[PDB]
């Protein structure tokens, strides 16, 4: 008989180079020598937050007592963006939990124990340097503008909801970073745009997608759900009506197969119903600490897209 013990894996690959086609962090895993630097049995502490907004998802990691060779490989490439993947689970499988580029790295080795630090960004390089220069005339179909701008961003299309037969009412011009322009189109058309684990997600506010996840005491829930406001401020109201404005909170054992834009079903004894996801935070302490995930849910009032 065994116990139920945690497991994880961390991989470091070649520098990421942006080209003239969508970037996939998967293909950069292999190093010039072939197999990548894998780190399994070392105490690790990490925190990974995810959201549906302009900003990329960022995660922090700490590793104790790394071998000198690995640290040397990171002393080099300090000018470059190494690709990194993280996996976690329970002794039988490990689900992808983050993938991005090493934004920052530093080492402090006071006496007894060295402590390496990381800051990782989910597509930070693309979202902050992809320039654009486009224009359109009166009568252009809005569905064409959306596709044109996304292709400029150079990322795979996770999911998109086209506008239909919508047409521009006035001439438009777009410059600067493509991400910023798209985030502005979100406000005026009730659409949510956010990149996550390399995938572009374009959806409509208020509406939600089946029960892709069910939460219950069998599903490793942790404590009862509690109602928490989804924003730190309140807006004036007429009392688009379809927009968000309500939510709840839940916690569960670590499970990387969840994304901010997904949908979940809450099977508890007090609260029951369907909710959207709005925010994720993954925490982990291998030898000591939690191994759980926190979800911020938001009520929905739109159509079932």
């Amino acid at each position: 008989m065994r116990a139920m013990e945690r497991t994880y894996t961390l991989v470091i690959g070649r520098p990421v180079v942006i080209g003239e086609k969508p970037v996939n962090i998967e293909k950069f895993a292999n190093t010039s020598k072939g197999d990548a630097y894998e780190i399994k049995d070392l105490h690790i502490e990490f925190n990974v937050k995810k959201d549906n907004s302009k900003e990329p998802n960022k995660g922090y990691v700490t590793v104790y007592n790394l071998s000198d060779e690995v640290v040397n490989y990171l002393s080099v490439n300090q000018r470059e963006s190494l690709a990194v993947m993280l996996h976690a689970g329970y002794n039988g499988d490990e689900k992808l939990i983050f993938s991005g580029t090493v934004e920052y790295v530093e080492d402090d080795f006071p006496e007894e124990t060295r402590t390496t630090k990381f800051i990782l960004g989910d597509g930070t390089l693309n979202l902050t340097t992809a320039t654009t220069a486009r224009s359109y005339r009166k009568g252009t179909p809005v569905n064409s503008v959306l596709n044109d701008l996304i292709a400029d961003l150079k990322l795979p299309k996770g999911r998109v909801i086209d506008f239909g037969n919508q047409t521009l009412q006035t001439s438009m011009a777009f410059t600067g970073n493509a991400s910023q322009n798209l985030a502005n189109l979100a406000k005026n058309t009730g659409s949510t745009f956010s990149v996550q684990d390399g995938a572009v997600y374009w959806t409509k506010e208020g509406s939600r997608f089946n029960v892709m996840f069910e939460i219950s005491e069998e599903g490793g829930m942790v404590g009862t759900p509690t109602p928490k406001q989804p924003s730190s401020s309140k807006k004036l109201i007429k009392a688009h009506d379809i927009k968000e404005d309500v939510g709840m909170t839940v916690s569960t054992l670590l499970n990387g197969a969840i994304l901010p834009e997904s949908t979940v079903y809450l099977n508890t004894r007090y609260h029951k119903g369907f909710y959207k996801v709005a925010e994720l935070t993954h925490r982990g302490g291998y030898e000591t600490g939690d191994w759980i995930t926190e979800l911020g849910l938001v009520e929905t009032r739109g159509e079932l897209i």
Binding site: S231, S232, S233, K235, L236
Partner: peptide, 26 residues
């Protein structure tokens, strides 16, 4: 024990976010 400190830092960050983003019609 860092758990206790992280909570206070989080609360202070929350207060600052509220101070920046408040009221408004948009």
């Amino acid at each position: 024990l860092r758990n206790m400190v992280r909570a206070v830092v989080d609360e202070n960050n929350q207060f600052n976010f509220n101070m920046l983003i408040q009221g408004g019609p948009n």
